Each structure stands twice: as C-alpha cells, then as structure tokens.
Amino acid sequence: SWEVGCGAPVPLVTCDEQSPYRTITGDCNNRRSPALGAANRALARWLPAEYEDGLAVPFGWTQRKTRNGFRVPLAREVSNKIVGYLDEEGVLDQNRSLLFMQWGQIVDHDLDFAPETELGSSEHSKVQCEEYCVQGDECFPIMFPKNDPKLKTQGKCMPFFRAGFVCPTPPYQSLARDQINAVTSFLDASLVYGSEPSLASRLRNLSSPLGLMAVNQEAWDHGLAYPPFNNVKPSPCEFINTTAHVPCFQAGDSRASEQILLATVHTLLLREHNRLARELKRLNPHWDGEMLYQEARKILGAFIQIITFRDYLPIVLGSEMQKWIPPYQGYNNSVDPRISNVFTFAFRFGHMEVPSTVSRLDENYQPWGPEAELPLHTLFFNTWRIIKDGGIDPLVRGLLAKNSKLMNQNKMVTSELRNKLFQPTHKVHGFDLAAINLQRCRDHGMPGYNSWRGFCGLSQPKTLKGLQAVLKNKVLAKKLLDLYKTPDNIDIWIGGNAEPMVERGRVGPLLACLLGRQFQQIRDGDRFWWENPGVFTEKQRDSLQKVSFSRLICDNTHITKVPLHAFQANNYPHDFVDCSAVDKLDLSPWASREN
Ligand code: HEM
Ligand SMILES: CC(=O)N[C@@H]1[C@@H](O)[C@H](O)[C@@H](CO)O[C@H]1O
Ligand SMILES: CC(=O)N[C@@H]1[C@@H](O)[C@H](O)[C@@H](CO)O[C@H]1O
Ligand SMILES: CC(=O)N[C@@H]1[C@@H](O)[C@H](O)[C@@H](CO)O[C@H]1O
Ligand SMILES: CC(=O)N[C@@H]1[C@@H](O)[C@H](O)[C@@H](CO)O[C@H]1O
Ligand SMILES: OCc1cccc(O)c1
Numbered sequence: 001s002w003e004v005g006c007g008a009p010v011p012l013v014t015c016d017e018q019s020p021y022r023t024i025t026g027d028c029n030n031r032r033s034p035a036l037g038a039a040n041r042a043l044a045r046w047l048p049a050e051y052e053d054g055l056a057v058p059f060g061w062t063q064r065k066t067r068n069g070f071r072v073p074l075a076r077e078v079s080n081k082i083v084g085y086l087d088e089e090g091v092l093d094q095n096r097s098l099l100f101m102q103w104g105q106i107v108d109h110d111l112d113f114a115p116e117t118e119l120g121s122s123e124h125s126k127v128q129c130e131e132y133c134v135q136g137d138e139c140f141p142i143m144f145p146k147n148d149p150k151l152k153t154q155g156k157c158m159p160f161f162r163a164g165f166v167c168p169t170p171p172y173q174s175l176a177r178d179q180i181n182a183v184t185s186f187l188d189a190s191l192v193y194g195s196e197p198s199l200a201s202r203l204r205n206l207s208s209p210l211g212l213m214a215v216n217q218e219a220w221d222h223g224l225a226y227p228p229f230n231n232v233k234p235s236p237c238e239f240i241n242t243t244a245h246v247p248c249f250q251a252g253d254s255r256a257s258e259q260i261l262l263a264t265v266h267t268l269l270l271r272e273h274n275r276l277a278r279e280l281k282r283l284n285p286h287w288d289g290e291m292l293y294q295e296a297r298k299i300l301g302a303f304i305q306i307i308t309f310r311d312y313l314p315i316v317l318g319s320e321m322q323k324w325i326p327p328y329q330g331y332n333n334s335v336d337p338r339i340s341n342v343f344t345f346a347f348r349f350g351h352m353e354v355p356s357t358v359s360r361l362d363e364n365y366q367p368w369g370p371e372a373e374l375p376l377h378t379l380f381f382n383t384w385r386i387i388k389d390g391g392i393d394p395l396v397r398g399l400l401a402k403n404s405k406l407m408n409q410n411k412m413v414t415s416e417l418r419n420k421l422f423q424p425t426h427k428v429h430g431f432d433l434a435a436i437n438l439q440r441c442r443d444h445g446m447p448g449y450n451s452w453r454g455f456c457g458l459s460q461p462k463t464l465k466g467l468q469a470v471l472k473n474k475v476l477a478k479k480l481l482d483l484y485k486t487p488d489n490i491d492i493w494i495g496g497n498a499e500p501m502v503e504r505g506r507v508g509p510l511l512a513c514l515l516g517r518q519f520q521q522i523r524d525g526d527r528f529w530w531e532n533p534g535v536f537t538e539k540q541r542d543s544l545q546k547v548s549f550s551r552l553i554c555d556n557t558h559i560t561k562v563p564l565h566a567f568q569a570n571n572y573p574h575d576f577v578d579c580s581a582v583d584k585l586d587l588s589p590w591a592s593r594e595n
C-alpha cells in the first residue's frame with residue numbers, strides 16, 4: 001500500500017451502532033473498519049496484481065512484452081481453439097436444473113460488479129475503439145486472429161473497455177491498479193434493493209406508507225407485478241425489438257435484463273418483497289413505511305443467504321464444501337468480508353453451465369405455444385417476450401423442468417454466448433463472452449494459473465505431462481500449451497474451468513478453493529448474517545429454516561406444481577408435487593406486540 005490508505009471517493013457515512021438494519025451501501029457492517037464490504041471500494045487483492053508494467057498495463061497490451069518469456073495468446077484465439085464447440089446434443093447436466101445456472105448468476109450479481117470505465121459519454125474514442133479497433137487508454141480491443149470467421153463479417157476486433165478503478169478514473173502511478181466493486185460484498189439482496197442511495201429510493205414506492213417496492217404501471221402478469229421500466233434511452237431492450245417498444249426493467253442491479261431468465265428471477269424477488277411487506281402490515285398494522293420496507297428487506301436477504309448456503313453451494317463445491325465452508329461458528333469481526341478480484345473470475349464458471357436454448361412450458365409442462373423453445377441469443381435484453389408472450393409462469397416452469405448445461409472439457413461455452421453475445425451500445429449479436437472473460441482477466445491484472453494453484457496448496461505443473469495429469473486430459477493440455485507455452489501463463493478463468501470437477505460438485509479443486517474461501521468469508525465476516533445471534537430471534541430462525549425456491553415460486557406465480565428440491569434435475573409429473581406439499585414461511589414470529 002504505497003499510500004497507507006487511498007480513499008478520496010466518499011470516505012464519509014455516519015455509523016448508527018443501534019441499527020438492526022444494514023445500510024444500503026454496506027458501510028458500517030464491520031464496526032472497527034466500517035468501509036469493509038461496502039460498495040464502490042476496491043476489490044480485495046488476495047495476491048499482488050500482475051501487470052506487464054507492475055502497475056496497470058495488462059499482459060497482452062504490448063506485442064513485444066512477454067509474460068515469463070512468452071507472448072500471451074489472443075483471448076479470441078483461446079476462445080476458438082479451446083472454448084468453442086458445435087454439437088449441443090448430449091451437453092446437458094443430467095442432475096442440475098436450469099435454475100442451478102440461474103441462481104448462480106443471481107448470487108454473482110449480489111456480490112460483485114466491476115463497471116466498464118466512465119471517462120466520457122460523448123466520445124470520439126468510442127468510435128476509435130469500435131470502428132477502428134485502435135488500442136489506447138481505456139479501449140483494449142479484442143483482436144480477431146487470422147482464420148476467424150468473424151474477420152469476414154464483423155471487421156478486425158470486438159470492442160472492449162477497461163474496468164473502472166479507484167482514486168478513480170484518469171490514470172495514476174501509485175501501488176497497482178485496483179478495480180472497483182460497485183455492489184455490496186455482503187449477500188444481502190443488493191440486487192433487488194440497490195447498493196447506492198439514489199437507486200434504492202428510486203426503486204421504493206414512497207407514494208404510500210406500505211414499504212412496497214415500486215412496480216410497473218403499464219404491464220401486469222395475471223394481476224401479479226413486474227418491475228418498473230427503466231425509461232432512460234438508449235435502452236437495449238428496446239433496441240433488440242423496436243416494434244414492441246418494451247424497455248428494460250429497473251432493478252437493484254443494473255444488469256437485471258441481460259437475459260430473460262435473470263429478469264424472471266428478479267421479478268420473483270420483487271414480488272416476494274411486496275408479498276412480505278403486505279403480510280407484515282397485516283400482522284403489524286401500526287408499522288410505518290420504513291420499518292415495513294426494512295423488515296421485508298431483512299427477510300429477503302436471509303432467504304438469499306439460506307438458498308445459497310444450504311441448497312446451492314453444497315452442489316457446486318461438493319466434497320470440498322466441508323473443507324472450506326464448515327458449520328457456522330458465529331460472526332467474526334477479524335474476517336475480511338470483501339469480494340476478491342479473483343473471485344469475480346472464479347464465479348464465472350457459470351458461463352460453462354448456460355445451455356443454448358430457453359423453453360416456455362405450459363401447466364402440463366409441455367411446450368407453451370408453437371415457438372416454445374427459443375435460441376438463447378434472441379433473449380439477451382429481451383423483456384418483450386415476458387410482457388407480450390405469456391408472462392413469468394412459462395419461463396419459471398422451464399427453469400424447473402429443463403437442465404443446466406454440464407461443463408465439458410470439449411464443449412465449454414455455448415456458441416450463443418461465445419459468438420452471439422449482445423452488448424448494449426454495440427449493435428450486433430456478435431460478441432464472445434469467453435474472449436471477454438480472458439481479456440478481463442488481463443485487464444484486472446490476474447496472477448496466472450500456477451500462482452493460484454500455489455495459493456490453494458495445489459501442485460504447480462510445469463510440463464505438458466504434468467498438465468495432462470492435473471487436467472486428466474492430454475488433448476486439452478496440449479491445446480492449452482500450444483497457446484500458452486507454460487502453464488504459468490494460463491489465464492485463471494480458463495485454467496480453473498479446465499480442471500475436472502470434484503466429486504458431487506460442478507467445479508474443480510482450484511475453483512472450489514477460491515470459491516470456498518470467498519463464501520466462507522462473506523458468511524463469517526457479515527455482522528448481519530441471518531444465523532448470527534441477535535439478527536433474528538430463535539423463533540424467526542426456525543421459520544426461516546424452511547424457506548425454499550419452490551415456495552418462492554408457489555407464492556409469487558400461478559405455478560402450482562413444483563419439485564421439493566428445485567436445483568436437481570426434475571421431470572414432470574414424477575418429480576413434481578402440489579404447492580400444498582411444500583413448507584410455508586411462517587411469519588407469525590414477526591408479529592410484534594406493544595403496550
Ligand atoms: C445467459 C447467462 C449469462 C450471460 C448472458 C452473462 C453475461 C455476462 C457478461 C456480459 C459479463 C460481463 C463480462 C465482462 O465485461 O467482463 C458477465 C460477467 C459475469 N458473469 Fe455472467 N452471464 C451469464 C451467466 C452467468 C452465470 C450463470 C454466472 C455464475 C454462476 C455468471 C457470473 C458472472 C460473473 C461473476 C461476472 C463478473 C461480474 C463482475 O464482478 O463484474 N454469469 N456475464
Ligand atoms: C440421481 C442423482 O444423482 N441424485 C443426486 C442426489 O442424491 C443428490 O442429493 C442431489 C443434490 O442436488 O444431486 C442428485 O444428482
Ligand atoms: C409506482 C407504483 O408502484 N405505485 C404504486 C401504486 O400503483 C399503488 O396504487 C400504491 C398504493 O398501493 O403503491 C404505489 O407504489
Ligand atoms: C424481430 C422481432 O423480435 N420481432 C417481434 C415480433 O415477432 C413481434 O410480433 C413484435 C410484437 O411484440 O415484437 C417484435 O420484436
Ligand atoms: C474464534 C475465531 O473465530 N477465531 C478466528 C481466528 O482463528 C483467526 O484469528 C481469524 C481468521 O483470520 O478469525 C478469528 O475470529
Ligand atoms: O450480465 C451482465 C451484463 C452484461 C452486459 C451488459 C449488462 O448490462 C449486464
């Protein structure tokens with residue numbers, strides 16, 4: 001830390017100490033160090049950043065600057081040679097529902113967001129990046145290799161802008177550059193409520209003292225609500241269909257409409273808040289607008305924590321879950337709650353779980369209409385298919401009855417993401433998420449694969465033969481070394497994902513360690529963790545223990561047949577029960593007496 005502490009962007013915020021509620025920003029969770037875990041601060045560095053100049057220049061920036069004596073391969077070349085595949089047949093995960101992928105994305109958005117840098121709206125440099133592909137300042141274009149089909153139809157590169165960093169936004173020459181996490185590190189439903197005071201208030205309904213979240217006033221789903229529209233233009237949800245004129249949703253997190261199933265789960269979560277807020281007011285008529293909002297917010301936060309740690313993590317981490325996330329032993333004010341920079345790449349394992357299509361299903365869980373199944377690329381920034389084509393129920397049924405993609409060393413990332421990605425402001429369904437990930441690895445100054453293996457106590461292969469053994473795959477290891485020339489240079493996103501999965505899990509040993517450590521930290525380092533004594537009464541906890549995603553579905557949609565365990569692969573009718581067989585959330589313990 002060249003300076004003993006760089007913090008010019010908001011160092012301020014008075015701490016309450018008497019508050020039973022979290023701040024919107026995450027400040028004041030940790031009493032000794034109140035900025036820890038708060039939004040718009042640097043991502044934590046678990047290892048020192050690795051830049052070609054030691055400070056800020058990404059590896060790959062200068063042709064003539066090697067990493068460990070070898071040129072780094074183009075991100076898109078790695079994507080084409082390693083990450084892509086043609087045949088979608090046989091790629092699905094026979095024991096994870098599509099909800100498993102989807103919940104991952106939700107959790108991710110709760111924990112981290114490193115926004116692409118600001119520096120200007122009215123930019124000649126935007127054209128310079130996109131139209132001319134000239135690298136400079138925050139433009140760091142993804143150059144196509146020779147033989148790339150995209151060279152024939154899309155020009156010479158994909159645009160790419162470097163992430164924002166603290167002391168923030170023009171270049172500085174201090175300790176190494178740290179990217180910003182714009183959301184709260186805590187698992188706290190910041191994706192529903194926001195991590196900033198402007199947004200958080202804009203999302204609430206302050207026209208009535210009921211503690212409700214604002215809802216769309218233009219469209220309804222069989223009498224159930226949608227999020228408000230975002231009426232700032234240009235709107236990518238309008239751009240993908242200028243006939244329908246259906247804008248993006250507005251949600252605690254700016255990414256909520258990135259694809260239709262994310263927007264779908266966001267809508268469920270908004271619905272749950274208002275459902276909770278209405279029950280609380282009925283149970284506690286005296287309660288004012290603020291306390292309703294806050295008590296509802298507190299419950300929803302616990303919901304996300306429980307679903308995540310009880311149901312989701314054990315089937316991601318499998319046999320490693322015990323080793324990294326043992327049983328909760330209480331809040332620990334020494335633990336660093338911040339999301340680490342590497343975690344934002346590790347958690348991108350979910351990209352390899354996204355399948356190539358999305359289905360709308362009817363009440364018999366048969367295809368909903370003649371175009372029930374849609375290619376995923378037509379569903380980026382697509383809100384019109386929700387509002388104009390059956391609402392949420394058909395998509396939720398698909399989330400329950402369809403499968404996630406299985407990660408596969410020879411079928412890594414679906415072409416829907418790898419060749420067809422839509423990015424707002426750019427006009428085409430023509431980007432490559434895997435190339436973006438790799439380029440972003442470099443932008444953030446990530447240490448390589450072997451540095452992370454050492455970090456996790458795992459062997460550091462230096463040879464082809466050693467890499468074959470770690471990957472349990474000769475052909476993959478050989479492709480990777482042909483590109484990277486030393487395992488020391490393999491980008492963490494691809495190195496971590498290339499490892500065979502652990503038993504009963506869906507990530508390899510390296511990622512399980514990285515993810516495992518991070519999740520242990522956001523639990524043990526959270527003063528408002530749901531199971532921390534003082535946060536919820538014992539009675540409130542016994543009620544919270546029975547939450548489930550199936551119950552979330554049942555309460556907030558007109559889906560009446562659900563599985564007991566919604567993350568595993570479930571088939572209809574054999575694996576589905578009526579909602580009456582699913583435990584309710586008993587909110588009687590929130591009844592507050594007075595007098
Ligand atoms: C159809 C599904 C998905 C799409 C279209 C999508 C798209 C994207 C895009 C465009 C980015 C920003 C890339 C960059 O500029 O660096 C991103 C980042 C990310 N994605 Fe996804 N993604 C999807 C699913 C998932 C899943 C399933 C997970 C995890 C289980 C996940 C985790 C992440 C994470 C951790 C980041 C980095 C967030 C940050 O700190 O800024 N994504 N994704
Ligand atoms: C048929 C089968 O493999 N069932 C397992 C089940 O034992 C396990 O508890 C569950 C966790 O989600 O994952 C399933 O794949
Ligand atoms: C923008 C918005 O959501 N306005 C709703 C309004 O439609 C509703 O009638 C009122 C009272 O229940 O609560 C407001 O929040
Ligand atoms: C290219 C495209 O997606 N066109 C759809 C069209 O099929 C639909 O009838 C219309 C009305 O919702 O919305 C448009 O966006
Ligand atoms: C009782 C307890 O939790 N002790 C741990 C201790 O092992 C360690 O010093 C630190 C982890 O960095 O967190 C403390 O709270
Ligand atoms: O899912 C992340 C994402 C990606 C691109 C644009 C967005 O607004 C959000």
Ligand SMILES: [Ca+2]
Nearest residue numbers: 110184186190
């Ligand atoms: Ca959060």
